[PDB]
């Protein structure tokens, strides 16, 4: 049992016997990769063998199992370098990703490109195909250039393995040719372009990923297959019931769409329109506000949990940060935070504003072991909660609060007592939500 990172300098987390949840392993993973509390929910555990994701609440018990720490949730053109496509941003009282997440995504992107989890798009013509191969050489140049730039200093290990096997089938002269062309690209890029266009590492990673969005098939999207699909509203009933024949695609920007497996994708729903999701065995039922619903049969209960985890996560990212659509995949932290009236890693400004409107409890934007109370630090040590500086802990946040409310809190030349908590409200705006 081990959790793997696409970052090279980061060794994998090995786990001993005992129970874990995917969430806390993701917490540990985040801390290991210096991923901020803000970006944590963008990540999840992926089993490269079963090709399934873990729900935040999935219990893991220790055998030998290789799980992958992956950025799962994605919004095309988060980078904003695509002047044609849509613009993505976090609300402010602001980009989606921070440097940590960006680095990890870059590493993951390289991994996906090379190992072909991000398969290169199909060619429209021979010429287009060659152009694609050339772009791949470009990508290799970007990767290498970035590596050299980072440490202050062959293309084979930086291109999709498919293209590698393809190139290995051509005559030796052509391979020498490809080498020469690549060397020329690399040289010309590092000698002229880096300086001329003042290309930083950031720009580099951005162009790389931005290029992945157009170079590869369905980047950042998750496609699920089914042979039993039902869409029903007060206007229509479409019942598809034939090998699998139908596809349901999930993306952050467009939401839930579906089609016949080779047609243009049909829009079923964006996430804020969803009221709830029910799972029964392999059957997933998604319900919208206008009572329009989708039902589909997946291949297992696990795949159902995977799917609903994806949709629920996106809902949390786009609609309501402190809500869950399905008990089966309900993240422990979201539940416990709902129960304790505690906010996610919101900006302090939001907290202040919320106080102006009508104390506030919020997780820290800096580290995972702290709850900020509005500014005062509360420490969370291995299941136990306590006030920073003190030496008395409690089995839960509630008990701490109960004890805390009875105290006269003193700051420099000021004394007061905690009054009431302004807990989160439904679908309220904050930097935890992605505007699209």
């Amino acid at each position: 049992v081990e959790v793997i990172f696409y970052l090279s300098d980061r060794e994998p987390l090995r786990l001993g016997s005992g129970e874990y949840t995917a969430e806390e392993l993701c917490i540990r993973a985040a801390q290991a990769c210096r991923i901020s509390p803000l970006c944590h929910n963008l990540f999840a555990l992926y089993d490269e063998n079963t090709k399934l994701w873990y729900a935040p609440n999935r219990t893991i018990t220790v055998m030998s199992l290789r799980l992958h720490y992956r950025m799962r949730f994605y919004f095309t053109n988060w980078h904003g370098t695509n002047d044609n496509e849509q613009s993505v941003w976090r609300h402010s009282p602001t980009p989606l990703l921070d440097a940590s997440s960006l680095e990890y995504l870059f590493a993951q992107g390289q991994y996906d490109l090379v190992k072909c989890l991000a398969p290169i798009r199909d060619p429209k013509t021979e010429q287009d195909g060659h152009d694609i191969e050339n772009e791949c050489l470009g990508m290799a140049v970007l990767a290498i250039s970035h590596y050299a730039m980072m440490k202050k200093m062959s293309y084979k290990r930086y291109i999709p393995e498919t293209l590698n096997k393809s190139i290995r089938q051509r005559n030796l002269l052509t391979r020498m040719r490809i080498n020469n062309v690549f060397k020329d690209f690399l040289k010309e890029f590092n000698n002229k372009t880096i300086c001329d266009s003042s290309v930083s590492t950031h720009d580099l990673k951005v162009k790389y990923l931005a290029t992945l969005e157009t170079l590869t098939k369905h980047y950042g999207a998750e496609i699920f297959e089914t042979s039993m699909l039902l869409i029903s509203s007060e206007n229509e009933m479409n019942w598809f019931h034939s090998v699998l024949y139908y596809e349901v695609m999930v993306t952050g920007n467009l939401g839930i769409q579906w089609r016949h497996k080779p047609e243009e994708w049909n829009n079923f729903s964006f996430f804020p329109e969803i009221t709830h999701i029910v799972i029964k065995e392999s059957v997933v039922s998604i319900n919208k506000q206008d009572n329009k619903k989708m039902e589909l049969k997946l291949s297992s209960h696990e795949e159902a949990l995977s799917f609903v985890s994806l949709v629920d996560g996106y809902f949390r990212l786009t609609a309501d940060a402190h809500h869950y659509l399905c008990t089966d995949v309900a993240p422990p932290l979201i539940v416990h935070n709902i129960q304790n009236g505690c906010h996610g890693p919101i900006c302090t400004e939001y907290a202040i504003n919320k106080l102006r409107q009508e104390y506030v409890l919020r997780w820290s934007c800096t580290d995972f072991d702290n709850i900020l109370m509005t500014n005062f630090q509360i420490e969370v040590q291995k299941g136990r909660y306590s006030l920073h500086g003190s030496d008395r802990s409690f089995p839960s946040l509630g008990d701490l609060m109960s004890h805390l409310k009875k105290q006269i809190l003193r700051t420099d030349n000021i004394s007061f007592m905690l009054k009431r908590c302004c807990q989160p409200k439904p679908r309220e705006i904050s930097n935890l939500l992605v505007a699209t």
Binding site: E135, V141, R170, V181, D184, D196, K207, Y208
Partner: peptide, 29 residues
């Protein structure tokens, strides 16, 4: 033929390596 394939077209810089800049200019004498 050894060179009878697309890779022996004239080199063209991949657009992925094209980092555009405003490049405004002024003529000062």
């Amino acid at each position: 033929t050894l060179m009878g394939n697309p890779w022996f077209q004239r080199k063209k810089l991949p657009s992925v390596l094209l980092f555009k800049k405003p490049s405004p200019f002024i003529f000062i004498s």
